[PDB]
Amino acid sequence: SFKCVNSLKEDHNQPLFGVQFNWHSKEGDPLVFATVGSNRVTLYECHSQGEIRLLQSYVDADADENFYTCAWTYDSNTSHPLLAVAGSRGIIRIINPITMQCIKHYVGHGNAINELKFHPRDPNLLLSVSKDHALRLWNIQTDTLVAIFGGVEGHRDEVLSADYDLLGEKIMSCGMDHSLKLWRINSKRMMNAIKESYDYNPNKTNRPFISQKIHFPDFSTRDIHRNYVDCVRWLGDLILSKSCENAIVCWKPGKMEDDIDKIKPSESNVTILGRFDYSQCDIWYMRFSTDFWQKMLALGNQVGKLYVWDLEVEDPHKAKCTTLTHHKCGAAIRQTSFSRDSSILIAVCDDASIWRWDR
Numbered sequence: 001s002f003k004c005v006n007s008l009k010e011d012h013n014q015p016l017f018g019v020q021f022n023w024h025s026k027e028g029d030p031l032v033f034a035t036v037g038s039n040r041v042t043l044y045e046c047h048s049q050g051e052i053r054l055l056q057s058y059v060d061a062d063a064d065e066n067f068y069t070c071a072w073t074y075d076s077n078t079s080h081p082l083l084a085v086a087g088s089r090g091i092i093r094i095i096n097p098i099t100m101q102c103i104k105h106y107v108g109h110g111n112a113i114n115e116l117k118f119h120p121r122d123p124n125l126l127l128s129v130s131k132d133h134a135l136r137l138w139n140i141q142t143d144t145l146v147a148i149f150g151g152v153e154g155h156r157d158e159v160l161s162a163d164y165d166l167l168g169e170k171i172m173s174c175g176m177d178h179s180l181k182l183w184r185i186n187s188k189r190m191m192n193a194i195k196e197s198y199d200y201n202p203n204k205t206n207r208p209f210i211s212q213k214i215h216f217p218d219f220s221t222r223d224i225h226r227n228y229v230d231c232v233r234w235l236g237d238l239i240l241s242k243s244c245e246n247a248i249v250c251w252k253p254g255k256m257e258d259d260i261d262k263i264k265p266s267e268s269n270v271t272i273l274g275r276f277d278y279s280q281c282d283i284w285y286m287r288f289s290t291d292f293w294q295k296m297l298a299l300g301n302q303v304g305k306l307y308v309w310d311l312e313v314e315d316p317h318k319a320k321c322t323t324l325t326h327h328k329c330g331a332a333i334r335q336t337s338f339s340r341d342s343s344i345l346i347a348v349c350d351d352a353s354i355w356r357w358d359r
């Protein structure tokens with residue numbers, strides 16, 4: 001079980017909106033996590049006796065920038081870790097975490113980015129989610145925009161979150177329009193788009209890289225929540241999503257026995273496999289997280305309380321809850337992150353504080 005071993009506060013005193021452990025850190029090396037808040041990204045190293053060692057920050061040139069999200073990947077030739085960050089400016093930055101240098105940046109239409117996720121099987125494929133109602137898939141090896149997920153049947157308002165399934169064959173996105181949309185990326189069209197993005201070398205051709213515009217999702221539902229869906233994650237062939245109604249719903253498209261890969265775009269049914277209720281987390285912009293093995297689920301609330309569900313149960317509705325409190329932790333917990341071995345849980349707050357819980 002978890003015990004709070006340390007806490008700290010960042011100098012800017014602004015909320016921390018994101019935290020991510022590097023699950024790509026090498027064997028023997030200490031555990032490293034990134035935090036995002038104000039116009040800054042900061043790296044910390046976890047040590048024994050609850051020590052958190054401050055490393056280095058990337059500070060944006062624009063004092064008005066607000067970083068909302070960050071994601072770890074690695075260089076496809078050298079295996080060296082890389083960090084992607086984005087926020088209110090709508091600029092994706094790829095940072096070398098060693099020197100904290102921005103090595104490259106991407107701009108779509110330049111509208112705020114709410115979330116970044118790297119493909120689970122391809123370190124080069126970066127998904128961004130935006131306030132401009134679209135999702136974008138980038139190939140950071142060839143610096144190309146592979147596809148835009150939006151359009152005529154896409155999200156009708158700001159996209160807040162998205163997630164890849166286990167194999168990275170499909171994406172589930174959600175947002176302010178109350179819907180959850182499924183986008184299949186193993187279609188012939190998307191497989192060909194990805195292949196072509198790898199074959200693109202502008203020094204070797206005349207054609208622009210031709211990005212796909214995907215106007216139609218493979219499934220859509222507004223039957224789960226009755227407000228903004230601000231967080232989504234796959235749990236195998238199941239979905240975990242939350243709104244600001246003090247609940248994470250575990251559901252699936254179609255009827256109970258319907259296979260996710262036989263689901264058609266016209267599908268009108270959803271099946272609810274359970275709901276995890278909690279308290280005082282009815283404000284927008286609160287993220288839940290799972291550990292690497294998806295044995296645990298974590299979410300913080302508006303008043304500094306942490307909830308942890310044990311998912312190692314036969315059916316989702318049988319999950320066992322544990323609550324984590326500390327008399328000095330009273331600010332809203334915006335995001336949590338587990339280390340790869342799930343031995344450490346970091347929570348980040350509205351008052352720029354960082355809390356370390358060791359298993």
Ligand SMILES: CS(=O)(=O)c1ncn2c(NCc3c(F)ccc4c3CCO4)ncc(-c3ccc(C4CC4)nc3)c12
Nearest residue numbers: 119121122125167168169185186191192194195196198
């Ligand atoms: C070899 S490559 O450079 O083309 C390549 N390098 C990486 N590729 C990825 N990565 C994402 C990925 C994945 F790694 C695992 C599961 C998954 C996807 C996306 C949909 O389902 N996807 C697709 C491809 C890919 C491969 C082969 C083909 C056939 C020859 C025409 N088409 C597409 C790919």
Ligand SMILES: CS(=O)(=O)c1ncn2c(NCc3c(F)ccc4c3CCO4)ncc(-c3ccc(C4CC4)nc3)c12
Nearest residue numbers: 015017018068114115160161230231285286287334335
């Ligand atoms: C400026 S804004 O309100 O339009 C905004 N626009 C986008 N914002 C994001 N986006 C990331 C995001 C998300 F899309 C969904 C879930 C999620 C977060 C981060 C933690 O949990 N996060 C936070 C915020 C946010 C919230 C509260 C406040 C101050 C303390 C009162 N300021 C900003 C945000």
